[model samples]
Target: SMNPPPPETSNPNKPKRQTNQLQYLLRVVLKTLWKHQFAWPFQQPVDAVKLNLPDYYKIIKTPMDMGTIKKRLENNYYWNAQECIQDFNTMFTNCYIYNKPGDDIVLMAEALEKLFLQKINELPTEE
Candidate 1:
């Protein structure tokens, strides 16, 4: 009777499925990650020519950044919560591996990574 109980959507937090995840992702998480103080160096692809990193890809193999994540968000690249977070993880790992022992970029990446972890925790999980 009552419209078939609306297909059990009253369970809460799982109605819109992926949209529920985006509610957390798009709300302020990624934007703040992009605008964070330590995110400048990671906003885009590393300029191998400008930074004299001709062998950059040879070293990093996979590069990730806020701009790429932003583009991914605009498209359908991020189908789940862990996908984008893994990119962030790889981005930090690349920074740690490529930079000098105590490079400024490494320090910045550490801080940004910390912030990212804190934010991503708030996003919905599939449990």
Candidate 2:
């Protein structure tokens, strides 16, 4: 006779390991933005992940166009730090709800936020 298997139990205290959807989406969008361009600012693909959105704003000559961006992407679009942050926040929130527990997500959101704020604060103002 064989012994019975132990029952499975889920833990509420554990942190969730989220999916790569956010990171992947961001990368795809970056690829499209950099597409057909001779100069790619980053040497390694993953390194691009660490870039501040505003820094990308500096390098990219093209203006933000949601429709064109989407059509170009497997699926994606983002322009400006605010727009980029908004889009990331939306997708991240939406996916976060559906993803299984014991997962984590991308670092792009915080990076973008930090850069966006820093750039904002650095701008000169006339009193």
Candidate 3:
């Protein structure tokens, strides 16, 4: 049972979702957890499946590299768009895999991608 929004949508009234470094990592963690054995219809869900091995390794490195991003977003380390984009690309690819065949999943993936792009655009470009 999918519920549609009201007929007259209010753009300004739509709540803005905030995205920070830790939240992104936690989002992946939660998704992976859900896909673990206990939470879904499928008994043996994958823990972050990577279509390509190299891509998967890069994606797997994201959570490991969270400390640097956490520091930058915390205003301790200097922000780098290049670094942010690389991580965003990794996360995007990882999340995008789950968006197939399900409307709800695809919609969320698109929204998350939009937010990811927004965050990427907002990052400071300093070496």
Candidate 4:
């Protein structure tokens, strides 16, 4: 008589895989930010002299940008989704501080902020 086959199991390395998932999700979001129409202003650090706003740095103590976020993601500087969102939020807030209401940059901040948060929320939570 033949014996039953051994059972199979699906066990993932959750500890390591979760970290990869976070990086992948952040990577996806980074591309969207780069492609956004309002990406110009936030693409790199503000050149106060170029923009003729010497007080730019003084007004925004913690300046953030797409390049900064991308650097962090590419270098594995972020440990989790919140940390990534934290920097993005910091970028948006800095934009808000420097621009007036109804301004394109501020609008970009709102739209991209929501866009990022929504994308982050929609990522697969499965391990």
Candidate 5:
């Protein structure tokens, strides 16, 4: 005859099973890439909201000034020139390729790229 069976007991230290590898990897990648990057999706100070972008020609008087705005916007919630370029590029590439409103996407993409280049030209030589 077999000996009496031991009673089952839950182990609190058991390792958890990874049900979503993709999500875990994506989370790790984003965290790694944006350690110093701005707090995206929300501005640093929750109450501080800046809606209208300052006049490009008036306030952004020099390449150096443009650089300042670029850095500031990185921390601001409403403006992100780099994100705008990426979004515009995705729209043109995906929507246009799929035969969806290519003209508007193309124009928007062109405008964003043009603005980005214009600002890039203003950056200091050491930047």
Candidate 6:
């Protein structure tokens, strides 16, 4: 949840822009291309109420076939994961090239990449 709006103080004049917080979250969701980015949607804190994404689609098969995944992306006009991986790598490389040594963001990204590769190795193959 976002930080609550501060109490109205005696500023006499405070301009309010019509920016929707939900729009900001959706923008971040669409822009981020990290492998573990889906982790955000799956997040759940202990004892928290279930957070559900409402889907009124007709009954789907078990494991939610890969076609469903592909169609969802196509419907949203989202960047292809194959293309996203290249851009993600290039983004980090460019940032590191112009940034100071041992930048935390670059280090974190590298760690996340390693974690993603490790997880890939652990997934069971249907073949």
The residue-by-residue lDDT of candidate 5 on 1-127, one tens digit each, is 2222221122335422322322222233223322422223111211112423233223222111122222332333222234323432443343234334546534544444454445444433321
Q: Give the TM-score of candidate 3.
A: 0.35
RMSD of candidate 5 to the truth, in angstroms, is 22.1
Question: Per-prediction count of colliding residue pairs?
Answer: 0, 7, 0, 0, 1, 0
- Taking all chains together, each candidate's TM-score versus the true structure is 0.77, 0.24, 0.35, 0.77, 0.24, 0.31
What tens-digit string does per-residue lDDT give for candidate 4 at 1-127?
A: 2222211112233222237556655567888878888788887777777777877777877777787777666656655766667777888888888889998778878888887887877776635
Candidate lDDT values, in order: 0.69, 0.33, 0.39, 0.70, 0.30, 0.33
Candidate 4 wrong stretches, greater than 4 Å: 1-18
Error of 1 at 45 (Å): 0.8
The TM-score of candidate 1 is 0.77
Q: Over the stretch 1-127, how does candidate 6's per-residue lDDT look in tens digits?
A: 2222321222325322212322221233222323354333212111112323122111111112112232333333223343323333443454355436777645654564465445434433322
Put down candidate 3 lDDT per residue, 11-69, tens digits, no spaces: 34443333554344335433443343333322121233332333433333333123333
Stretches > 4 Å off in candidate 5: 1-101
Q: Please state the error at residue 117 of candidate 5 in Å.
A: 1.0
True lDDT of residue 84, candidate 4: 66
Cα lDDT tens digits, model 1, 1-127, are 0111111112234322355565466555678778888888888777776777767777876777777777665554555766667777888998888888788888898887787778887777655
- In Å, residue 108's CA in model 2 sits off its true spot by 12
TM-score of 2: 0.24
Model 1 residue 80 CA deviation (Å) reads: 0.9
- For lDDT, candidate 3 versus 4, the one ahead is 4
Cα deviation in Å at residue 31, candidate 2? 5.6
